[PDB]
C-alpha cells in the first residue's frame, strides 16, 4: 500500500507480450463498430510485438487527480468607500456560489453529467494600498445558506452569525481555508439538467433549477480608515473525495453566462479549436 501509494504504482498498465506470426482464420482486426461497442485489438494482435514489462501508473489519471486541484472560481472585489460607510449594498460583497463563473475549471467537470464531492475552499485576500498606510484591515467571510438574511448593507444583524459561519482573517495571519461537506438535497451535484421550474412557459430550465446553494458575503470589519484601499479576495476551490458518473464530450465553444449551454456568440461566427487543412493528402 505504502510503497504502491508512495511510489505511486497503484493502477498499473499491463505489459506488451511477445507475438509470432499468424496465418490464421480469425481476424481480430475486423469488428463492426456499428454495434456501438469498442474494439478490443492490441499491439500483440496486429504486429509481431516483443516483450516490454511496463511501469506506468494510471494513478494521475483518476477522477481525483483530474479533479482534486484548486481553481479560481471567483474574485470578490471591494473598492472601499469612507465617504458613505454602510449605505445600501456597499463595502460588503455577496456572491452566489457556483463552479461556472470561471471557464477553466467549469470546463473540466462538465466532462461528466453528475458529480459529487466534499469541497475545500481557500481564500486569498490581497490588500491593495491606494493610501499611504493600510492599517489593520480585518475581514469577515460569512456563508449564507439558502433562505437567510443576506446583509442589506455592511452592518446588518446578520453579521452576528449566531448560527452561521463566518471566517475571520487579519492582515499577516495566513490564508483562510475550510472544508465543506457535500451540500445537496440530491445524491449528487447536477453538473447538468433537462428540467424546468414548471409548466410556466416562462419557467427556468438548466443547472439552476436545481442547484441553489446559498451565498458568501464578504465584509471588512475594521470600521472607517483614513487612507483608502481596495480588497480582492480570490476564491479557489478543490474537490476532495470525488465521484463521477456518465462522461460527456468536452466543450469546444467558448461559453458565455453560466447555468446554460448557450454558445451563440455576439455576432462573431461560432468558433472552435479545429484547424483548417489545404489538403487531406499531406499533414
Amino acid at each position: 500500500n505504502y510503497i504502491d501509494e508512495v511510489l505511486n504504482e497503484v493502477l498499473v498498465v499491463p505489459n506488451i507480450k511477445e507475438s509470432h506470426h499468424t496465418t490464421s482464420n480469425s481476424a481480430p482486426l475486423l469488428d463492426a463498430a456499428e454495434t456501438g461497442h469498442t474494439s478490443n485489438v492490441q499491439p500483440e494482435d496486429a504486429i509481431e510485438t516483443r516483450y516490454v514489462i511496463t511501469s506506468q501508473t494510471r494513478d494521475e489519471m483518476s477522477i481525483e487527480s483530474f479533479l482534486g486541484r484548486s481553481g479560481c472560481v471567483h474574485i470578490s472585489r471591494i473598492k472601499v468607500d469612507y465617504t458613505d460607510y454602510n449605505g445600501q449594498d456597499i463595502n460588503f460583497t455577496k456572491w452566489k456560489i457556483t463552479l461556472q463563473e470561471m471557464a477553466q475549471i467549469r470546463r473540466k467537470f462538465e466532462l461528466f453529467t453528475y458529480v459529487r464531492f466534499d469541497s475545500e475552499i481557500t481564500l486569498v485576500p490581497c490588500i491593495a494600498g491606494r493610501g499611504d498606510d493600510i492599517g489593520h484591515i480585518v475581514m469577515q467571510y460569512m456563508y449564507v445558506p439558502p433562505g437567510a438574511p443576506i446583509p442589506s448593507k455592511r452592518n446588518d444583524f446578520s453579521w452576528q452569525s449566531g448560527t452561521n459561519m463566518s471566517i475571520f482573517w487579519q492582515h499577516g495571519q495566513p490564508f483562510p481555508r475550510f472544508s465543506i461537506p457535500f451540500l445537496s438535497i440530491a445524491s449528487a451535484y447536477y453538473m447538468f439538467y433537462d428540467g424546468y421550474d414548471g409548466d410556466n412557459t416562462s419557467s427556468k430550465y438548466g443547472s439552476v433549477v436545481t442547484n441553489d446553494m446559498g451565498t458568501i458575503c464578504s465584509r471588512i470589519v475594521t470600521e472607517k480608515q483614513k487612507l483608502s484601499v481596495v480588497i480582492t479576495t480570490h476564491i479557489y476551490h478543490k474537490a476532495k473525495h470525488t465521484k463521477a458518473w456518465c462522461p460527456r464530450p468536452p466543450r469546444a465553444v467558448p461559453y458565455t453566462h453560466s447555468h446554460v449551454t448557450n454558445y451563440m456568440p455576439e455576432t462573431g461566427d461560432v468558433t472552435t479549436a479545429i484547424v483548417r487543412r489545404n489538403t487531406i493528402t499531406t499533414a
Binding site: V10, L11, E64, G68, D118, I180, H241
Partner: peptide, 19 residues
C-alpha cells in the same frame, strides 16, 4: 505519518485513496 484526521468531520480530510 497518516490517518490522523485531526478534524472530527469526514468532509475534512485529505484527498481520498485509490483502490
Amino acid at each position: 505519518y497518516f490517518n490522523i484526521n485531526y478534524f472530527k468531520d469526514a468532509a475534512s480530510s485529505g484527498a481520498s485513496r485509490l483502490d
